[PDB]
Write a protein that binds this ligand. Structure first.
Ligand SMILES: [Cl-]
Ligand SMILES: [Cl-]
Ligand SMILES: [Cl-]
Ligand SMILES: [Cl-]
Lengths: 268, 266
């Protein structure tokens, strides 16, 4: 087992009802990381579905969650031969935290694209640079110790402020941490965390290092084989406190597997 | 003279029939075959959502399309999920003939009309509207909008060009035929993001291309007038494609970012 496998398990407690334990190791401060809460909700949805994969998932974040127990309430909105859509909502201390709606279907793992834009040039993982997480009061050194994130030299330079930031862009490789048990066993389970496992892109543009997510929708495009994911994060506009963070993930083979866009407002 | 209001203004109004309950008439003029255009269905849901909100604007709207709608009456059911000082989130579902058509969840907030970007990537180069081309010809959806394509985009659609990267750009607006430019562009954005030819047309022949999910974000209050657009797509595989539409207003300000995931087949 990897820490993630244990941390993200959801137990069926009743019909359309699940129980989960939020692992404080995924705290980014006083709130749980959003991607971790997505991972748990994704599990609830596929448990209720006749299809294997979460092909489009839209999540609306209402309030921060903390460690300990949380409860999940699911609802199938539409069942179909190709697409089955499930609504899943997370509760904690009598309050709604987050709601997701997921279009589930079963993708062909050997499907050949009819068209595919090339993966943008990203340096090999060995030429990339990682920042060793220092110790933290957060349980087991909090969120930053749950994932290994390798940045291209330019991305590192950007985050470390040792270079000019003309256009906001980060890239490199991401995976579950070596510390917690190595690469994800089930990549698909990890994608919802992966899309939200990187430094907020806004940190490169205004002087806020984070924002609570308001909305994130992400799409599964191909079935990835296990291993670290190549990532690229961009932003087209910061205005009236609002910013867009666009994260794409590719696999070892250069196959686009995830396209994510979240919207968040600074100072909330 | 001119009509004091557009077809769109009448066609997309919603009546409150009870608590968290609205009635709406789907205008057959917005049909693409037997199924109502998705953006028109979004416009109507957005109205119901804002009617239930203490905030003015639909900042993030995520929509899941369960089944196609036909013309005639439909009923809308709303639900406030979260109320806040900055954000209020409203769920809204559309029903027709006892069946769930579409469900949207909208993060609503009030954006500052005078707010200026702290950062902005550049609008892509798009020829002016006068150098663009409109298809010369249909009492359905294509007559509800006026869509001008860059010469290269027109050439691509007309198959007069070798397409490499699937891209379309130009200007879009409510049609002259229907009363001219949108009088409330904020109400028109949910239709605009889904008012273009499917991007997958450039890559494959297709007989059906239904939207599965669309999420779009409102980035600035647009000034009235035709919207500059750009539509792109990164992968068409296993019968699915992504359609990414960005919209800018007359002053080159980014106002909408849309991504939909859709099926494609023959
Ligand atoms: Cl925090
Ligand atoms: Cl059903
Ligand atoms: Cl079906
Ligand atoms: Cl509330």
């Amino acid at each position: 087992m990897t820490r993630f496998d244990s941390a993200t398990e959801v137990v069926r407690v009743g019909e359309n009802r699940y129980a989960v334990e939020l692992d404080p190791g995924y705290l980014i401060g006083t709130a749980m990381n959003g991607g971790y809460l997505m991972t748990v909700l994704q599990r609830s949805a596929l448990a209720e579905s006749d299809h294997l994969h979460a092909v489009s998932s839209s999540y609306h974040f209402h309030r921060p969650a903390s460690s300990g127990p949380a409860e999940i309430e699911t609802r199938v909105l539409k069942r179909g031969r190709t697409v089955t859509t499930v609504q899943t909502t997370l509760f904690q201390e009598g309050r709604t935290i987050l709601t997701g709606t997921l279009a589930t279907a079963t993708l062909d793992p050997h499907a050949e694209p009819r068209y595919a834009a090339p993966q943008p040039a990203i340096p090999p993982q060995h030429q990339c640079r990682r920042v060793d997480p220092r110790q933290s009061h957060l349980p087991d050194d909090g969120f930053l110790a749950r994932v290994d994130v390798d940045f291209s030299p330019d991305s590192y330079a950007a985050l470390a402020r040792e270079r000019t930031v003309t256009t906001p862009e980060l890239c490199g490789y991401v995976d579950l941490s070596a510390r917690d048990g190595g690469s994800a066993k089930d990549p698909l389970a990890f994608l919802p965390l992966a899309v939200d496992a990187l430094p907020p892109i806004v940190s490169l543009l205004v002087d806020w290092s984070w924002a609570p997510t308001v909305e994130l929708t992400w799409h599964l495009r191909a079935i990835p084989e296990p291993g670290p994911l190549a990532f690229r994060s961009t932003c087209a506009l910061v205005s009236d406190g609002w910013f867009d963070e666009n994260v794409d993930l590719w696999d070892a083979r250069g196959r686009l597997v995830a396209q994510s866009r979240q919207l968040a407002r600074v100072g909330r």
